[PDB]
Design a protein around this ligand. Structure first.
Ligand SMILES: NC(=O)[C@H]1CCC(=O)N(Cc2ccc3[nH]ccc3c2)C1
Ligand SMILES: [Zn+2]
Length: 139
């Protein structure tokens, strides 16, 4: 679990969005596993606007942060889960690191701000849904 709070927006994994997120929907994209909802309170976070390929993510299944080198956002095949059929997930960044399904929502950050959130993983892999291209989150 986890979310990004920026301005009057809340960014969550689309597969973990609540009834309240859907009732306050701003934008969602199944191919990216993202959903953005509106909030009444002003948010705690800053979005990175950069091309960093290193950063640090929070891993809830270890209660720890880990440094990572990750790929640029791209279209990657993701196997079927209980939430989606087998498909290509877009705007996904992969890195070597520990992750389990419940780690989804953990933030990846660089020196410039929030880069994305945990969305996928495998045997020693962790995948992050990028949010740096969503310029409208800042206004
Ligand atoms: N973005 C997606 O399509 C998600 C939907 C929710 C989901 O359970 N998965 C599978 C998954 C996620 C993180 C994982 N970390 C290590 C194994 C593992 C497996 C894929
Ligand atoms: Zn950066």
């Amino acid at each position: 679990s986890g979310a990004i709070y920026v301005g009057n927006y809340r960014v969550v994994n689309r597969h973990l969005a609540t009834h309240n997120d859907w009732a306050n929907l701003v934008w969602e994209d199944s191919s990216r596993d993202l959903l953005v909802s509106s909030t009444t309170a002003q948010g705690c976070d800053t979005i990175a606007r950069c091309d960093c390929q290193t950063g640090v993510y929070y891993c809830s299944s270890r209660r720890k942060h880990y440094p990572v080198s990750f790929s640029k956002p791209s279209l990657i095949f993701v196997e079927a889960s209980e939430y989606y059929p087998a498909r290509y997930q877009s705007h996904l960044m992969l890195a070597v690191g520990h992750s389990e399904p419940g780690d989804c929502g953990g933030i990846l950050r660089c020196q410039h701000g929030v880069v994305g959130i945990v969305s996928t993983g495998g045997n020693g892999l962790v995948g992050f849904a990028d949010v740096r291209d969503l310029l409208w989150l800042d206004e």
